[PDB]
Each structure stands twice: as C-alpha cells, then as structure tokens.
Paper text:
We adopted the Z domain of staphylococcal protein A and its affibody binder dimer complex as a model system. We next generated libraries at the interface of a weakly associating dimer (Z+ ZSPA-1) with micromolar affinity to determine if we could affinity-mature the interface by coevolution. To clarify these inter-residue co-variations discovered from the sequence data, we determined crystal structures of 10 coevolved pairs that spanned a range of cross-reactivities and orthogonalities (5 from LL1 and 5 from LL2). From the structures, we could verify clear compensatory changes between the residues showing the most significant covariations (13A-9B / 17A-31B) in both LL1 and LL2 library mutants.
The highest affinity mutant from each library achieved approximately three-log enhanced affinity, KD of 1.99 nM for LL1.c1 (LIFFK/FILF) and 1.86 nM for LL2.c3 (LVLF/FIIV) compared to the original dimer (KD = 2.92 μM). The two mutants differ by only three amino acid positions (positions 17A, 31B, and 32B) but have virtually no cross-reactivity with each other. Z-A sequences of LL1.c1 and LL1.c2 bind to their own Z-B sequence 500-fold stronger than when mixed with the other’s Z-B sequence. Due to the rotation of Trp35B and Trp35B-centered hydrophobic packing induced by Phe32B, the N-terminal end of helix 1 and C-terminal end of helix 2 of Z-A tilted 17° closer to Z-B. Furthermore, the compensatory relationship between position 17A and position 31B is clearly revealed from the structures of LL1.c1 and LL1.c2. Taken together, the synergistic effects of the geometric change and compensatory mutations found from these three specificity-determining positions resulted in biased specificities of the two high-affinity variants evolved from the same library. We also followed a single mutational three-step evolutionary trajectory from LILFK/FIVM to LIFFK/FILF which are the two high affinity orthogonal pairs from LL1 library showing similar thermodynamic trends. A dramatic thermodynamic transition occurs when Leu17A was mutated to Phe, to produce a less favorable binding enthalpy compensated by a more neutral entropy in specific mutant (LIFFK/FILF). For example, A-LILFK has more Z-B binding partners (B=77) than A-LIFFK (B=15) from the LL1 library, and A-LVLF (B=53) and A-VFLV (B=42) are also more cross-reactive than A-IVFF (B=3) from LL2 library sequence data.
Author numbering:
A (entry chain B): 4 to 57
B (entry chain A): 0 to 58
C-alpha cells in the first residue's frame, strides 16, 4: 500500500504550514496505518491547520 | 508487546525516514513496508535508512 498516492498524501500533510511536528508525525502515522483513509486524514489535517492559522 | 499506535519509536522512524533528503521514493516506500512487516525493526531500519541517505549524498 506504500505507493505514489501514499507519497503524495504524506507530502500534503507535512507541507501544511500551521501544523507542528508532533501533529504531522501523528497524521503521517495514521496514514501509514491506513493509506485508504488518505482523503479523510488530509481533510482533517487541513481543517486543523486552518484552526491554527496565525 | 507494544501496539503500533502506542509506539513512539515506530512513529518517529516513519517521520524521520520521510524527511531524509537523499533516498528515492522506492527506498522510502520499501522502508515503510518493512516497518509494517515488523515494527520491532524500527531502530534497525531507521539506521539503515540514514546509512543509505549518507552513502547517496550528492557531494
């Protein structure tokens, strides 16, 4: 399940500018644990990123 | 027994491997699969990844 789509989703997580390292690590773990949840996880991470906007 | 969600060593290894600058995508993904196959190998696989990263330095 670790293919090109996985790489894209992981990059999307780590480039969210307002998440901190523990948060990105946690999202990346969740993606690794279930790559089929990428859409839900990416939407969750973006929502949290926006909640943390300066 | 350490469950994956409760395993900081596995989670840190995934995060560090994803950041390594000199691996290719195939290497990264192979490490992620090897971690899935046996999370007790996190320390060994992270060390192997850093070794390959350093061997593959562009200068």
């Amino acid at each position: 399940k670790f293919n090109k789509e996985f790489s894209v989703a992981g990059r999307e997580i780590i480039t969210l500018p307002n998440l901190n390292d523990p948060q990105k690590k946690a999202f990346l773990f969740s993606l690794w644990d279930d790559p089929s949840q990428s859409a839900n996880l990416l939407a969750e991470a973006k929502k949290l990123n926006d909640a943390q906007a300066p």
